[PDB]
Amino acid sequence: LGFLGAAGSTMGAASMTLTVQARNLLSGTVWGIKQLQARVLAVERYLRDQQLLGIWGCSGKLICCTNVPWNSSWSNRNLSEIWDNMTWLQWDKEISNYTQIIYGLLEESQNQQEKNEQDLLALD
Amino acid sequence: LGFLGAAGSTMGAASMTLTVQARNLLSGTVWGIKQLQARVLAVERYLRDQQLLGIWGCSGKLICCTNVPWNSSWSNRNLSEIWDNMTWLQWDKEISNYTQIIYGLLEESQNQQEKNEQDLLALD
Amino acid sequence: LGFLGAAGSTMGAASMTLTVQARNLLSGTVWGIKQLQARVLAVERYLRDQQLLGIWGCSGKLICCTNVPWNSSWSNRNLSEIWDNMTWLQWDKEISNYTQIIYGLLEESQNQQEKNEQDLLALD
Amino acid sequence: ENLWVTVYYGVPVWKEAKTTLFCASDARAYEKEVHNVWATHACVPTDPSPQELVLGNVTENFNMWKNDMVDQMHEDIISLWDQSLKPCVKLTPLCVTLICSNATVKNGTVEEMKNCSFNTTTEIRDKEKKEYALFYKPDIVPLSETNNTSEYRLINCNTSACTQACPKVTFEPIPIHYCAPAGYAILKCNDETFNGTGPCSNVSTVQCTHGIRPVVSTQLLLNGSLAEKEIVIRSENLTNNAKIIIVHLHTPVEIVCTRPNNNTRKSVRIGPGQTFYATGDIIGDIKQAHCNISEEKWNDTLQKVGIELQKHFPNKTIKYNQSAGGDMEITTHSFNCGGEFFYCNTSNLFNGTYNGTYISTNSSANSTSTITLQCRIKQIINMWQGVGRCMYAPPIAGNITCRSNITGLLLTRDGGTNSNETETFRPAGGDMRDNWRSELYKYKVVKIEPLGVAPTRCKRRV
Amino acid sequence: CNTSACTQACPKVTFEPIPIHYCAPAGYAILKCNDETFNGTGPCSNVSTVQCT
Ligand SMILES: *[C@@H]1O[C@H](CO)[C@@H](O[C@@H]2O[C@H](CO)[C@@H](O[C@@H]3O[C@H](CO)[C@@H](O)[C@H](O[C@H]4O[C@H](CO)[C@@H](O)[C@H](O)[C@@H]4O)[C@@H]3O)[C@H](O)[C@H]2NC(C)=O)[C@H](O)[C@H]1NC(C)=O
Ligand SMILES: *[C@@H]1O[C@H](CO)[C@@H](O[C@@H]2O[C@H](CO)[C@@H](O[C@@H]3O[C@H](CO)[C@@H](O)[C@H](O)[C@@H]3O)[C@H](O)[C@H]2NC(C)=O)[C@H](O)[C@H]1NC(C)=O
């Protein structure tokens, strides 16, 4: 399936082969400052996602359950309609509006959960 | 509290909102080579902390207990005087002298602890 | 032992002090675009190993057991002959041919293993 | 029985590979100004740190003629010289004719120079004035196809317009330290008997190479490093006689060169906001520039080279001859004596033969006696290609002396003769890589490959 | 012509003093002495932080 063969196929199909896309953030050697600009832009853009996914406690690579529940008003759908027939490529378009509150919740939930790993370790 | 609103407040207050400061190592688009230099410097400086904190086993984001004890000669204080009234900003100045031995201990302790994860898994 | 003093010594000796080599990916301040090119090249090269070792589930720093068994045809050796007398520096030369299948196995095994962390957590 | 694959990172493993390398220089040079010089102006300050660390046991191979580091140094030096010649005046009005007095002497045996006269622009574009300036003879070419004695021109204005070197920036050989970037390393062949190829017995690692002096000479190697043991001969090949053969001495030979003439600078204005410098007058009497070398020391040195060179020409003689003639920029030992580009006839040095037995420094008529060489001086210097070539070296007042050490030779060999032992060696040179290759024979760059694989008795916990 | 050759300023480019904002890069910060009685040295009493002057 390579770089984007999983696109269009169902979300169940695209749930696998994520590693093929994660491995594809290298390219190029340089003439002029334009290509060097491209290299630095790519590195910064990758680290943006890397250091942002990590803040949610998802250091376990690239599929990561979180404690936050799903507010059904966002989709108003059953798990079959979300997953069995739809594709990721349009699902991103459908979910595109609500992202800020979701990211804030994922930030704060792990921000407050992290201290409890100290609290349930200091008894000894 | 944003970038530095927690500064000056007590270390207990500043223990929270660490995620707000970790999320603030991204900026800029370029004219000339000076701004490009700034971008590369920022990326290298961030990765230095990222890849140095990791060697101490602290891949669990940004609060991380370890096994090395407090040599009381470093501060000569009770946990209340360190924490309940003092602020991080002056605490860094007070602790600024002793850092090399602390970093060496934090390196060697995890260097020798990591093999025991093999040793207590090779029995099977 | 520093940067490369462990070279030539046995693999058992070189198994320790890995942290000394991991800490040695910083250098330089710049005249001209050549040295800036060197900096960007170094950063990209480091991240290539960092984000490739991560795909194998080895976020536990830098020694990481995997579930893939060793096909004895690759070496045809006992654990004593591999480890007690040989050195890493020649072992890399000896193993240099077979790397593609090893990396593919190490990728696919963790790609299929990660979902079971959801499956053995969805019962609740 | 059961063994599972484990991945190690931070491994001590490497490959020899290509990369760009930093400058580096000691801290004392940074007291000086901008553009004076590149060792400060275009190169990073660096204490030679971290210090040298010897490796306890390494299996290693080397080759110094295929090393890319010397080619990188060549590229750096040429492209940096091109940058350094940018901010200075490019002359150009001096392509006007020179009417030069037709002096004649009864073979004075001291080069007279030619005193010339020409027109130059005053402080207005439109009004002109006559000027005069003494020029060294080799840089001045007759103009007419007929037998005219009156008119002349500069040797340039047929290839390109030369650029005056600004006197604010010097030419001294400040040492350069070459440092590899992060992720790479330099492995130093610490063996004392290494001869330029094959395996080394003893290796070390150093972050920054120490003390490379960019000093340029054609035949003799000046102010270089000294070998730890016998006077090793080095060559890429000896079936291919055309391969230049590099000799690296154990002990030095002192050489002192000087220009007794007391020249005086002149200031000639050339258009708005720039000046052309030339020799205005010679104070005192006229005399001859030269180089002096200790006599018995050179004799002993050239016999000591023979006892080592003997082995690869086993049954034959070690006999020496002058260079094979040709262009004066090729045949002569050319170097800079602190501002003046000397060109020395070396024929006094290389004349003799050896018969296999070492001989003492006695008897001696007087140990203070010295062999002397005769050298000319230029100002229009054509040395490298693609750098914008010709550069006009400005004059320097007073007198000069540049006492230095000879620490190597560059030689060339003729073909076989009559199945006879008198095949002879000649000085030669001109490919600058040979100069820098004599100092980089120790080092080699590597790339660290810190990720590796091996099995052990440890499944994953999952 | 006694010093150097002067260069005409092209009339297409002006000389008006358009304001400039100085912004520190990532990892850095600017602290603004918000005190109204500051006299060019010593300690400030009230401080703020701003990304761009
Ligand atoms: C190199 O050659 C140049 C010319 O090719 C020569 O420069 C000329 O030198 C003369 C002599 O100094 C200059 O003329 C002098 O100008 C002064 C001005 O105050 C006059 O007083 C002098 O008059 C006396 O000398 C004349 C003979 O030179 C007599 O004819 C006269 O009656 C007086 O006795 C004299 O005119 C002249 O200006 C320069 N020319 C230029 C272009 O500079 C220089 O001297 C030569 N140098 C060497 C080392 O050979
Ligand atoms: C200009 O010419 C004068 C005289 O012709 C030069 O003077 C000579 O300079 C050398 C420099 O090495 C002097 O060397 C001496 O060396 C001994 C050690 O052998 C030392 O003890 C002395 O203190 C001295 O430095 C030499 O004595 C001196 N005089 C003579 C007659 O040779 C001068 O060097 C020339 N200037 C330039 C810039 O070249």
Author numbering:
A (entry chain L), B (entry chain B), C (entry chain F): 520 to 547, 569 to 664
D (entry chain E): 32 to 139, 150 to 185, 185A, 185B, 186 to 309, 312 to 321, 321C, 322 to 354, ...
E (entry chain A): 196 to 248
Text lifted from the article:
The HIV-1 Env is a trimer of gp120-gp41 heterodimers that are heavily shielded from the host immune systems by N-linked glycosylation and further protected from neutralization by conformational masking and considerable sequence variability. A glycosylated region near the base of the third variable loop (V3) of HIV-1 Env forms a supersite of vulnerability that is targeted by antibodies originating from diverse germline genes in multiple HIV-1 infected individuals. Here, we determine structures of antibodies in complex with HIV-1 Envelope for all observed members and ancestral states of the broadly neutralizing HIV-1 V3-glycan targeting DH270 antibody clonal B cell lineage. Here we used cryo-EM to visualize the interactions of a complete inferred DH270 clonal tree with the co-evolving virus Env.
The first intermediate, I5, acquired mutations that strengthened interactions at clusters 3 and 6 by improving protein-protein contacts as well as the interactions of the antibody with the N301 glycan, resulting in ~8-fold improved binding affinity to the d949 Env relative to the UCA. Comparing the structure of the UCA+G57R-bound complex with the I5-bound complex revealed further shifts in the orientation of the antibody orchestrated by the other acquired mutations in the I5 intermediate. The VL S27Y substitution near the β-Mannose branchpoint of the N301-glycan is the likely culprit, altering the orientation of N301 glycan in the I5-bound complex relative to the UCA+G57R bound complex. The I5 intermediate showed further rotation about the phi dihedral in the direction of the S27Y mutation without additional changes in the theta rotation angle. Together, these results demonstrate that early mutations in the DH270 clone facilitate improved contacts, shift the position of the antibody relative to the bound Env, and alter Env conformation, particularly of the V1 loop and N301 glycan, with the angular and conformational changes further strengthening antibody-Env interactions. The early I5 and I3 intermediates recognize only the Envs that harbor these shorter V1 loops and the G300N mutation. We demonstrated the early G57R and S27Y mutations that were required for acquisition of heterologous breadth by the I5 intermediate antibody altered antibody orientation relative to Env, and this shift in antibody position likely affected downstream antibody development.
